[PDB]
Amino acid sequence: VTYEEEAVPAPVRGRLEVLSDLLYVASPDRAMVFTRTKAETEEIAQGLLRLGHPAQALHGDMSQGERERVMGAFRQGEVRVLVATDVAARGLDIPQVDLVVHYRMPDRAEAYQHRSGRTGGRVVLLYGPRERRDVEALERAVGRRFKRVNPPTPEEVLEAKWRHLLARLARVPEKDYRLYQDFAGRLFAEGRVEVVAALLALLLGGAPAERSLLTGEEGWRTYKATGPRLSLPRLVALLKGQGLEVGKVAEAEGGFYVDLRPEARPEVAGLRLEPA
Amino acid sequence: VTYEEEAVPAPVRGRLEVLSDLLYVASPDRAMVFTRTKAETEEIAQGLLRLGHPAQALHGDMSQGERERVMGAFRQGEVRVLVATDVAARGLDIPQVDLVVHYRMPDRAEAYQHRSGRTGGRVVLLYGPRERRDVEALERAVGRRFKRVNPPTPEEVLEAKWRHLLARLARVPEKDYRLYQDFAGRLFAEGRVEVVAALLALLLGGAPAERSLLTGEEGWRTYKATGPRLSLPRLVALLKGQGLEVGKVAEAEGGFYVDLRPEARPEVAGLRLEPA
Ligand SMILES: [Br-]
Ligand SMILES: [Br-]
Ligand SMILES: [Br-]
Ligand SMILES: [Br-]
């Protein structure tokens, strides 16, 4: 084996978004994103374009003619990301890529090998809804231990957008951009830095939701909580005593995980609270 | 009649682009763009999105279900432009609009009235390939004299993009844009005004082609040429004497029209040369 495998934890809700973070943060020249069903490919493919990613889908209602253009654009560099099923994937007409992402893990360890094999390069599995056992079953089937890796921090992501956004800027002919050298001039003059920020948002897709890492649900910030003889009821009574809103509490390694609101600020005596 | 009608000259090549110029320059809250065939609507609709315009098509392979969403998005303000045929247009389920554009003039003066009637508001006919007689036939059928109007200058257009682009900026929450207040800060600091211009190009679609106003062809700048006893052969011999490349020459009102190259600079003694 000559590729690195990674299991990235991602709830079944923020997944699409985790996918996008990873694409920006790795800057693969070519990616392939394997899902389960035909329906999901267009679903996912649409939302990556939506998220600034050059992506197109691939399912089985593809006629030979409208499958080849796809592949042409993909290899050349026009579409940097391809979203497919295990079926529309096979064929000697399929490029080599930098990254494979298992959006929905392989329904068997033969479909993992044919999926990942297409890459040395990099392979990433998305799991969240506590698919953890399904993951280590794959590892048993496959006989490999996928290194667990953290998804990119929001900060990591932004420097990535920016970085991509810059390289993209350096691609604009002087004729194109000189056309706007007046308006850009107007801005710098009047020091309209807020306006420029707005511009960036328009391109980089602005504010992400604060999502829980236990439920993929928004309006939550997942935490790590450890404390003396701290069991759920206690941890919970301590938080409710501070008049907080408590969501998904689950048991962690050396403590509990506990969603609190994105805004709430947690200082409970004796109890040690960090985000995850 | 309670709407203003205009005939805008536009070659059969730069037409799509003339369409876009007009949309930006008028800033209609809702537009409807009538074409001839079903195929053209998606053709045109696609290229307006491509050109920064919120547009969607409407043809006849529309099933009741996937026709209504369309109309919902249109009236509400989601899609600001609708591209249709004379058939998929009829129905009591069709909004009132600010602008109607006859991309391809009405094949009869009943279809002009049902087209335009849907607007007081504004009606615009596109003609170019010397459809001028077809135009004044319509006027005879309809019994009205459409005021001839110039298409917007490239400069007119740009202030329009910009203007739209600004109002669009004022719509971004402080949370979205503050997310980028660092990067925007980096720019102003280092005075990277070229970079900002690039950003604008990315959004505003950069350099337009220099197109001939006689052939809709690019690599030409159409002119107006008048001179003493100036006939074609002479006008042409004068230009070729100055070692120029001459394209479509046609006869104008009080002179000739003559494409020359976008770069060429024309000073021929006695002959009076302006662009159109
Ligand atoms: Br990679
Ligand atoms: Br409890
Ligand atoms: Br208007
Ligand atoms: Br001649």
Side-chain angles (χ1 to χ4, degrees), chain B residues 8 63 74 89 108 120 136 141 152 169 173 184 187 234 266 275:
Chain B
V8 160
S63 47
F74 186 23
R108 96 189 32 55
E136 44 204 39
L169 289 171
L187 292 165
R234 162 154 202 81

PDB file of all heavy atoms in Angstrom, chain B residues 8 63 74 89 108 120 136 141 152 169 173 184 187 234 266 275:
ATOM      1  N   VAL B   8     -33.659  48.789 -30.065  1.00  0.00           N
ATOM      2  CA  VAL B   8     -32.254  48.936 -29.778  1.00  0.00           C
ATOM      3  C   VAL B   8     -31.468  48.171 -30.817  1.00  0.00           C
ATOM      4  O   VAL B   8     -31.641  46.961 -30.945  1.00  0.00           O
ATOM      5  CB  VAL B   8     -31.905  48.395 -28.363  1.00  0.00           C
ATOM      6  CG1 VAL B   8     -30.387  48.076 -28.220  1.00  0.00           C
ATOM      7  CG2 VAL B   8     -32.345  49.370 -27.306  1.00  0.00           C
ATOM      8  N   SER B  63     -43.237  20.778 -16.628  1.00  0.00           N
ATOM      9  CA  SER B  63     -44.412  20.156 -16.027  1.00  0.00           C
ATOM     10  C   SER B  63     -44.908  21.080 -14.926  1.00  0.00           C
ATOM     11  O   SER B  63     -44.106  21.732 -14.255  1.00  0.00           O
ATOM     12  CB  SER B  63     -44.117  18.748 -15.496  1.00  0.00           C
ATOM     13  OG  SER B  63     -42.922  18.708 -14.739  1.00  0.00           O
ATOM     14  N   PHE B  74     -39.454  34.063  -8.976  1.00  0.00           N
ATOM     15  CA  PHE B  74     -39.426  35.217  -9.875  1.00  0.00           C
ATOM     16  C   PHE B  74     -40.103  36.426  -9.234  1.00  0.00           C
ATOM     17  O   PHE B  74     -39.529  37.517  -9.174  1.00  0.00           O
ATOM     18  CB  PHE B  74     -40.078  34.851 -11.220  1.00  0.00           C
ATOM     19  CG  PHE B  74     -39.975  35.922 -12.286  1.00  0.00           C
ATOM     20  CD1 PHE B  74     -38.982  36.891 -12.246  1.00  0.00           C
ATOM     21  CD2 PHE B  74     -40.860  35.928 -13.353  1.00  0.00           C
ATOM     22  CE1 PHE B  74     -38.894  37.861 -13.240  1.00  0.00           C
ATOM     23  CE2 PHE B  74     -40.778  36.889 -14.345  1.00  0.00           C
ATOM     24  CZ  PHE B  74     -39.793  37.857 -14.289  1.00  0.00           C
ATOM     25  N   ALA B  89     -45.470  31.225 -22.132  1.00  0.00           N
ATOM     26  CA  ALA B  89     -45.691  32.549 -21.557  1.00  0.00           C
ATOM     27  C   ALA B  89     -47.138  32.771 -21.170  1.00  0.00           C
ATOM     28  O   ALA B  89     -47.421  33.368 -20.133  1.00  0.00           O
ATOM     29  CB  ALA B  89     -45.263  33.619 -22.538  1.00  0.00           C
ATOM     30  N   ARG B 108     -45.486  37.348 -35.358  1.00  0.00           N
ATOM     31  CA  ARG B 108     -46.611  38.184 -35.767  1.00  0.00           C
ATOM     32  C   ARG B 108     -46.947  39.271 -34.748  1.00  0.00           C
ATOM     33  O   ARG B 108     -46.516  39.225 -33.592  1.00  0.00           O
ATOM     34  CB  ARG B 108     -47.844  37.355 -36.147  1.00  0.00           C
ATOM     35  CG  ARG B 108     -48.880  37.158 -35.069  1.00  0.00           C
ATOM     36  CD  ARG B 108     -49.922  36.130 -35.521  1.00  0.00           C
ATOM     37  NE  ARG B 108     -49.353  35.108 -36.399  1.00  0.00           N
ATOM     38  CZ  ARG B 108     -48.302  34.349 -36.092  1.00  0.00           C
ATOM     39  NH1 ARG B 108     -47.676  34.503 -34.930  1.00  0.00           N
ATOM     40  NH2 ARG B 108     -47.862  33.446 -36.957  1.00  0.00           N
ATOM     41  N   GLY B 120     -46.720  52.744 -15.861  1.00  0.00           N
ATOM     42  CA  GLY B 120     -46.397  51.950 -17.032  1.00  0.00           C
ATOM     43  C   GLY B 120     -45.040  51.279 -16.914  1.00  0.00           C
ATOM     44  O   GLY B 120     -44.334  51.486 -15.922  1.00  0.00           O
ATOM     45  N   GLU B 136     -39.885  47.992 -39.048  1.00  0.00           N
ATOM     46  CA  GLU B 136     -40.895  48.964 -39.475  1.00  0.00           C
ATOM     47  C   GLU B 136     -42.129  48.319 -40.093  1.00  0.00           C
ATOM     48  O   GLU B 136     -43.134  48.995 -40.315  1.00  0.00           O
ATOM     49  CB  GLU B 136     -40.311  50.025 -40.400  1.00  0.00           C
ATOM     50  CG  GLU B 136     -39.387  49.495 -41.466  1.00  0.00           C
ATOM     51  CD  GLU B 136     -38.423  50.563 -41.949  1.00  0.00           C
ATOM     52  OE1 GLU B 136     -37.949  51.356 -41.106  1.00  0.00           O
ATOM     53  OE2 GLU B 136     -38.145  50.617 -43.167  1.00  0.00           O
ATOM     54  N   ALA B 141     -47.818  46.933 -38.709  1.00  0.00           N
ATOM     55  CA  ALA B 141     -48.795  45.995 -38.157  1.00  0.00           C
ATOM     56  C   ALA B 141     -49.405  46.566 -36.880  1.00  0.00           C
ATOM     57  O   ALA B 141     -50.622  46.756 -36.771  1.00  0.00           O
ATOM     58  CB  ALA B 141     -48.129  44.650 -37.852  1.00  0.00           C
ATOM     59  N   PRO B 152     -26.338  50.588 -24.352  1.00  0.00           N
ATOM     60  CA  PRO B 152     -25.498  51.292 -23.367  1.00  0.00           C
ATOM     61  C   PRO B 152     -24.001  51.232 -23.716  1.00  0.00           C
ATOM     62  O   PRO B 152     -23.518  50.197 -24.175  1.00  0.00           O
ATOM     63  CB  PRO B 152     -25.792  50.549 -22.055  1.00  0.00           C
ATOM     64  CG  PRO B 152     -27.104  49.840 -22.303  1.00  0.00           C
ATOM     65  CD  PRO B 152     -27.093  49.479 -23.754  1.00  0.00           C
ATOM     66  N   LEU B 169     -23.268  44.776  -1.750  1.00  0.00           N
ATOM     67  CA  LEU B 169     -22.337  44.746  -0.635  1.00  0.00           C
ATOM     68  C   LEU B 169     -23.019  45.189   0.648  1.00  0.00           C
ATOM     69  O   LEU B 169     -22.812  44.592   1.701  1.00  0.00           O
ATOM     70  CB  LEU B 169     -21.104  45.590  -0.937  1.00  0.00           C
ATOM     71  CG  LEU B 169     -20.244  44.919  -2.006  1.00  0.00           C
ATOM     72  CD1 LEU B 169     -19.181  45.866  -2.426  1.00  0.00           C
ATOM     73  CD2 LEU B 169     -19.611  43.643  -1.474  1.00  0.00           C
ATOM     74  N   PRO B 173     -24.256  40.955   6.299  1.00  0.00           N
ATOM     75  CA  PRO B 173     -24.221  41.148   7.745  1.00  0.00           C
ATOM     76  C   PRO B 173     -22.799  41.461   8.185  1.00  0.00           C
ATOM     77  O   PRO B 173     -21.845  41.037   7.513  1.00  0.00           O
ATOM     78  CB  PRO B 173     -24.652  39.784   8.286  1.00  0.00           C
ATOM     79  CG  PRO B 173     -25.438  39.166   7.165  1.00  0.00           C
ATOM     80  CD  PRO B 173     -24.762  39.626   5.921  1.00  0.00           C
ATOM     81  N   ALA B 184      -8.960  41.846   4.550  1.00  0.00           N
ATOM     82  CA  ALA B 184      -9.161  43.154   3.934  1.00  0.00           C
ATOM     83  C   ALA B 184      -8.155  44.132   4.539  1.00  0.00           C
ATOM     84  O   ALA B 184      -7.647  45.023   3.858  1.00  0.00           O
ATOM     85  CB  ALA B 184     -10.576  43.651   4.123  1.00  0.00           C
ATOM     86  N   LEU B 187      -4.705  43.982   2.988  1.00  0.00           N
ATOM     87  CA  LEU B 187      -4.647  44.612   1.666  1.00  0.00           C
ATOM     88  C   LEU B 187      -4.406  46.104   1.779  1.00  0.00           C
ATOM     89  O   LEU B 187      -3.479  46.638   1.164  1.00  0.00           O
ATOM     90  CB  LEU B 187      -5.947  44.396   0.903  1.00  0.00           C
ATOM     91  CG  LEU B 187      -6.257  42.955   0.470  1.00  0.00           C
ATOM     92  CD1 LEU B 187      -7.725  42.834   0.060  1.00  0.00           C
ATOM     93  CD2 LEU B 187      -5.342  42.510  -0.678  1.00  0.00           C
ATOM     94  N   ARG B 234     -12.926  54.822 -52.832  1.00  0.00           N
ATOM     95  CA  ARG B 234     -12.048  55.897 -52.384  1.00  0.00           C
ATOM     96  C   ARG B 234     -11.750  55.781 -50.886  1.00  0.00           C
ATOM     97  O   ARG B 234     -10.611  55.494 -50.495  1.00  0.00           O
ATOM     98  CB  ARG B 234     -12.679  57.251 -52.741  1.00  0.00           C
ATOM     99  CG  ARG B 234     -12.116  58.437 -51.994  1.00  0.00           C
ATOM    100  CD  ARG B 234     -12.281  59.733 -52.767  1.00  0.00           C
ATOM    101  NE  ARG B 234     -11.307  60.719 -52.303  1.00  0.00           N
ATOM    102  CZ  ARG B 234     -10.039  60.753 -52.703  1.00  0.00           C
ATOM    103  NH1 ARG B 234      -9.591  59.869 -53.584  1.00  0.00           N
ATOM    104  NH2 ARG B 234      -9.218  61.671 -52.226  1.00  0.00           N
ATOM    105  N   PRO B 266      -6.769  56.069 -36.720  1.00  0.00           N
ATOM    106  CA  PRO B 266      -7.082  56.589 -38.058  1.00  0.00           C
ATOM    107  C   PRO B 266      -6.999  58.109 -38.239  1.00  0.00           C
ATOM    108  O   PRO B 266      -7.906  58.827 -37.809  1.00  0.00           O
ATOM    109  CB  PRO B 266      -8.544  56.154 -38.264  1.00  0.00           C
ATOM    110  CG  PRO B 266      -8.996  55.524 -36.951  1.00  0.00           C
ATOM    111  CD  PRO B 266      -7.989  55.916 -35.917  1.00  0.00           C
ATOM    112  N   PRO B 275     -15.819  56.985 -34.050  1.00  0.00           N
ATOM    113  CA  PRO B 275     -16.498  55.711 -33.780  1.00  0.00           C
ATOM    114  C   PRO B 275     -18.026  55.888 -33.714  1.00  0.00           C
ATOM    115  O   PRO B 275     -18.511  57.023 -33.722  1.00  0.00           O
ATOM    116  CB  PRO B 275     -15.921  55.289 -32.423  1.00  0.00           C
ATOM    117  CG  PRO B 275     -14.632  56.041 -32.307  1.00  0.00           C
ATOM    118  CD  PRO B 275     -14.897  57.357 -32.967  1.00  0.00           C
TER     119      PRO B 275
END
